[PDB]
RNA sequence: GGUUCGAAGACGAUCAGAUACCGUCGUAGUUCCGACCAUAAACGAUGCCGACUGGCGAUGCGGCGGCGUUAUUCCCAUGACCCGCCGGGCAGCUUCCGGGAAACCAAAGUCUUUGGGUUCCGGGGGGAGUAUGGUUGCAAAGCUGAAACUUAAAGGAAUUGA
RNA sequence: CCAUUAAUGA
């Protein structure tokens, strides 16, 4: 039976995207039905932040950051636990998880 | 019916004169080639000439062993 | 009601609706309450006109009193604003209240201890009190709701416009309804001002009353 | 309902919505009759009649029952006609 | 057996203030007690029983299988009705659903075809009535022709007092609970399409509940 | 494109009945309408209505009854005699108490007890009760 | 694992409701009460319902308890509902009064007052929470 | 899996084309 | 012209076996132009045109009206924001309008109260999109398209256990 | 990282 009103993707219109390959396989994925994580990253988080901030030479010189932007499949993702399955009436429930933490 | 016209009685004649054969008694009825392949011929009864004695297995659950003849 | 020099509107309700604010409406707008709206401010918020939410309490006021029965109304709050309104109301008309923890099927299964079959309802809230209206789409109970700009019209019967968040709005209106139904029935006249202050309608919140607790002695 | 001669042979006429034009079931479990009270022009209070008013369960499962019932009282004198 | 009444109609039952069910219909109060038709309706009332279905779950331990009882129960004038109930023994089950088809009897209508002399005998008007894919339509029929009906809903006809009716089946109708539940629906809607010979306004009397409001609160709570 | 106007201002007014509306405003304005709107009014199923009259296809408003169940349309233009108009109200009409199928005819657009009456046929147009 | 079932927690619920007065706070002061105004049959269920009637007193004492209906708690909530304030927030010298409510009243009967302050209209319309 | 019929098929029309394109 | 990737194929692993998944390569191909074939889960599994039937928050287009903020500052007027309205374009949320077997659908509704107009297509599942005949193509293949024979099931939605 | 299969009727 039909799953999902707009089928398992962000298509309505358009008919055809471009591919993406996958980052954990290589998989090719239509660019509006990958999972797409925009991952920050301080290069370092806990542990050397105390390390870097007595062995710098400038003093109070901000970290840097890591941007990527990671595509990811349904097999990919859920395999690495990024979506998980949920109850049909709380399918359509889009909302985001929040940023407590 | 699809087509509602006023003169669409030749159309509504000639899609449902192609469509009869679709039907499975109505082909049967009105091809030969079923009567042809008959034995019987369309007919009922039928004599012939006993030549072996066939022992058949039967089928699903049931298990038996038929007695058929070849005629 | 309809052109009576007795049923009109007052200068002391039309200061008291003013102090309120029960024509300030919500942010939101519905479908239906668009006939009860006469000009949208700035900051996004509706008019109620007063006049016509003075006719629907009238209405209201007759759909009540032609109740012969006064003990058989119930008057439904689920929310913490009106609990103390409709307790004191019943209090002072005769109907039967309910002030939080409304039983799903108290008008549909016997077994139940609190069990009635009323004639007439009175709704705070619409989305507070949602179920009410589910079980008077099975028991023939008609349904009298405070609503606002945005709440819907849904398996409700007569509807006054108010504002339904304000905790003196809402007690406000609740006063103005119980004066009506005492002038109209053979209690208290016209005449004179009614004599029980409308602020013990108003729902009070803990901290005012520790406020006031901590400011009388 | 009458046959030949005339006699009222059903065994119940059933109720008419006042708003909508249609009869009311006997499982119709949401039809309402509203009573409006009447108020004495020279005293100001309840007299003793009533104005009835039915409300169909389609009606009310739509959303369309309190302006049918203004709409009703208006037009027999209930709300005055300025609103 | 001695009956304590629970709801107000069923006080006015006890206190026989009220002449029929005839206002109850009027009014469309629910029936909720089994013993209001045993009292008005109870001397001609009749029970039938059309199929026993032996539904069943899948559980751990095997099926549990459960009975599901349809009674069609009804005196031959006016007044029939359609009971479902599923319990675990089939007397229960049928008990049950002779209580529920009491709390939720219909009236059923009779007309005229042409003609309009002496008693009402088909159903005045093409109607219809379905659950499921089971459409039933009922159609009016001549005097001296009969049920030309299915048996089942031959009997339920023959229940009703219609003595001529013409029907028409559409869909899985081996499914006797939808086909039961579909001319239900058609003798339900029977009183329920709109009549060109009720163009008569209609005369509000006043209700029970408002007529003996004073009784109701002096004999109990 | 709009090929039956008849047809779709029914469905319209069909609608209309079907939601519940007091008044309904059909779009285009034809002679056949017209006529079947006063069919209606003479035998009581809608109420008086009028016609905006542009020097256009005119619109019509029409003050609605409950007391009309359902406007049908019976597309195409079939004929109707004396002798298949029994069957016609046998398998189009609800009863043979109350309901109209109209025809137009060259004496006039009427329904069926009037075509009874007048002992003439024509072609048919809808049904109404 | 500590834990109190419905068969004791309803019957002291009971016992608390209808003996508030003759129960205090000392444990083996109103289990001996307990004991002789409640036919226990076991020592063990009798100090169960003991113990949890002297946990519904020290919410008693730290609180109001919901799921129980005492007098004297029922008379002090009708005392605090039957209070009466002083001058009301509803009879004010200045109003605030907007200029849309000011034209409205204008156009009903009243439309010139007493203690009415029309004031002026909030400039600038944003007043949506931006997306996302 | 059909389509793997329907290759096979195919196989098998190209070997009754070849063996009748031999007489 | 062959950078990367990579049908066939070689080699190294795992496996009882791998003539696969994994890795190192690697022909045809993947890139451009001139000629072919017309096949996709070519799907929205929902043909095209027309009329009607709840709203809500948007967004894109063009136009219109109205507090104000910000640039051309040197005002009007044009750019960027705010609130609405107008026609449809992809859409989304609630739902006892209504439909359907249900999932669901503002269309999959206006359907036993059955008729707006119009093209294609289905008559239980296999055999079978097979044989033959005609036709197109360099070929692979494409269009039209059976029958004999065999079976009482095949299938769709939804529920409970496992 | 590897994991193949459980003879027919009831």
Not at chain 6, 82 to 93: A, G, R, T
């Amino acid at each position: 039976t039909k799953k999902r009103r707009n089928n398992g993707r962000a298509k309505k219109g358009r008919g055809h995207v471009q591919p993406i390959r996958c980052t954990n396989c290589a998989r090719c994925v239509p660019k509006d039905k990958a999972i797409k994580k925009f991952v920050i990253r301080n290069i370092v988080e806990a542990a050397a932040v105390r390390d870097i901030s007595e062995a710098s030479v400038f003093d109070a010189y901000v970290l840097p950051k890591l941007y990527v932007k990671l595509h990811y499949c349904v097999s990919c993702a859920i395999h690495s636990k990024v979506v998980r399955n949920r109850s049909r009436e709380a399918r359509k429930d889009r909302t985001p998880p929040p940023r407590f933490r | 019916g699809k087509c509602r016209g006023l003169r669409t009685a030749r159309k509504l004649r000639s899609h449902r004169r192609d469509q009869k054969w679709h039907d499975k008694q109505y082909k049967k009825a009105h091809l030969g080639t079923a009567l042809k392949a008959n034995p019987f011929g369309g007919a009922s009864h039928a004599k012939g000439i006993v030549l072996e004695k066939v022992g058949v297995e039967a089928k699903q659950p049931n298990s038996a062993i038929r007695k058929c003849v070849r005629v | 009601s309809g052109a009576l020099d007795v049923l009109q509107m007052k200068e002391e309700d039309v200061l008291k609706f003013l102090a309120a604010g029960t024509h300030l409406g919500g942010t939101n707008l519905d479908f239906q309450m668009e006939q009860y709206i006469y000009k949208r401010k700035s900051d996004g918020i509706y008019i109620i006109n007063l006049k016509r939410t003075w006719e629907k309490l009238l209405l209201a006021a007759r759909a009540i009193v032609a109740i012969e029965n006064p003990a058989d109304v119930s008057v439904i709050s689920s929310r913490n604003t009106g609990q103390r309104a409709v307790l004191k109301f019943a209090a002072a008309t005769g109907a039967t209240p309910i002030a939080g923890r409304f039983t799903p099927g108290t008008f549909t299964n016997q077994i139940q201890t609190a069990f009635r079959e009323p004639r007439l309802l009175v709704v705070t809230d619409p989305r507070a009190d949602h179920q009410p209206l589910t079980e008077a789409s099975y028991v023939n109970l008609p349904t009298i709701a405070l609503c606002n700009t945005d709440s819907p019209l849904r398996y409700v019967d007569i509807a006054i416009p108010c504002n339904n968040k304000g905790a003196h709005s809402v007690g406000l209106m609740w006063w103005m309804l119980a004066r009506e139904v005492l002038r109209m029935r053979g209690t208290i006249s016209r005449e004179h001002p009614w004599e029980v202050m409308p602020d013990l309608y108003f729902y009070r919140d803990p901290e005012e009353i520790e406020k006031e607790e901590q400011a009388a002695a | 309902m009458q046959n030949d001669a005339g006699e009222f042979v059903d065994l119940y006429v059933p109720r008419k919505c006042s708003a909508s034009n249609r009869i009311i079931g006997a499982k119709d479990h949401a039809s309402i009759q509203m009573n409006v009270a009447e108020v004495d022009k020279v005293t100001g209070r309840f007299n003793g009649q009533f104005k009835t008013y039915a409300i169909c369960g389609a009606i009310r499962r739509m959303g369309e029952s309190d302006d049918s019932i203004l709409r009703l009282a208006k037009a027999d004198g209930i709300v005055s006609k300025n609103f | 057996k001695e009956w304590l009444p629970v709801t107000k109609l069923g006080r006015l039952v006890k206190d026989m203030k009220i002449k029929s069910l005839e206002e109850i219909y009027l009014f469309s109060l629910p029936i909720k007690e089994s013993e209001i038709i045993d009292f008005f309706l109870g001397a001609s009332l009749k029970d039938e029983v059309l199929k026993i279905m032996p539904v069943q779950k899948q559980t751990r331990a095997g099926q549990r299988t459960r009975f599901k009882a349809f009674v069609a129960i009804g005196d031959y004038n006016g007044h029939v009705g359609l009971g479902v109930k599923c319990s675990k023994e089939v007397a229960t089950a049928i008990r049950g659903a002779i209580i529920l088809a009491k709390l939720s009897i219909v009236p059923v209508r009779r007309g005229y075809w042409g003609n309009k002399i002496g008693k009402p005998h088909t159903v005045p008007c093409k109607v219809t009535g379905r659950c499921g894919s089971v459409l039933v339509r009922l159609i009016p029929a001549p005097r001296g022709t009969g049920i030309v009906s299915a048996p089942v809903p031959k009997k339920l006809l023959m229940m009703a007092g219609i003595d001529d009716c013409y029907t028409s089946a559409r869909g899985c109708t081996a499914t006797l609970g939808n086909f039961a539940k579909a001319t239900f629906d058609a003798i339900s809607k029977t009183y329920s399409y709109l009549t060109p010979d009720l163009w008569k306004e209609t005369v509000f009397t006043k209700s029970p509940y408002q007529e003996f409001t004073d009784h109701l609160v002096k004999t109990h709570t | 494109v709009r090929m039956n106007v008849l047809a779709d201002a029914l469905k319209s007014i069909n609608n209309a009945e079907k939601r519940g509306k007091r008044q309904v405003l059909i779009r285009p304005c034809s002679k056949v309408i017209v006529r079947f709107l006063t069919v209606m009014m003479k035998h009581g199923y809608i109420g008086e209505f009028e016609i905006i009259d542009d020097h256009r296809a005119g619109k019509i408003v029409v003050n609605l009854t409950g007391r009309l169940n359902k406007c049908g349309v019976i597309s195409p233009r079939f004929d109707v005699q004396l002798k298949d108009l029994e069957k016609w109200q046998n398998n189009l009409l609800p009863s043979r108490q109350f309901g109209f199928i109209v025809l137009t005819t060259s004496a006039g657009i009427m329904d069926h007890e009037e075509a009874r009456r007048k002992h003439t046929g024509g072609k048919i147009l809808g049904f109404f009760f | 694992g500590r834990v109190r079932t419905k068969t004791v927690k309803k019957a002291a619920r009971v016992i608390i409701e209808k003996y508030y007065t003759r129960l205090g706070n000392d444990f083996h002061t109103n289990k001996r009460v307990c004991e002789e105004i409640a036919i226990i049959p076991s020592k063990k269920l009798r100090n169960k319902i003991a113990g949890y009637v002297t946990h519904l007193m020290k919410r008693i004492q730290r609180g109001p308890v919901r799921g129980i209906s005492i007098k004297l708690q029922e008379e002090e909530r009708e005392r605090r509902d039957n209070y009466v304030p002083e001058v009301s927030a509803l009879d004010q010298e200045i109003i605030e009064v907007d200029p849309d409510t000011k034209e409205m009243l204008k156009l009903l009967d009243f439309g010139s007052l007493s203690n009415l302050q029309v004031t002026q209209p909030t400039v600038g319309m944003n007043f949506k929470t931006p997306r996302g | 899996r059909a389509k793997w019929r329907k290759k096979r098929m195919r196989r098998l029309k190209r070997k009754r084309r070849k063996m009748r394109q031999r007489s």
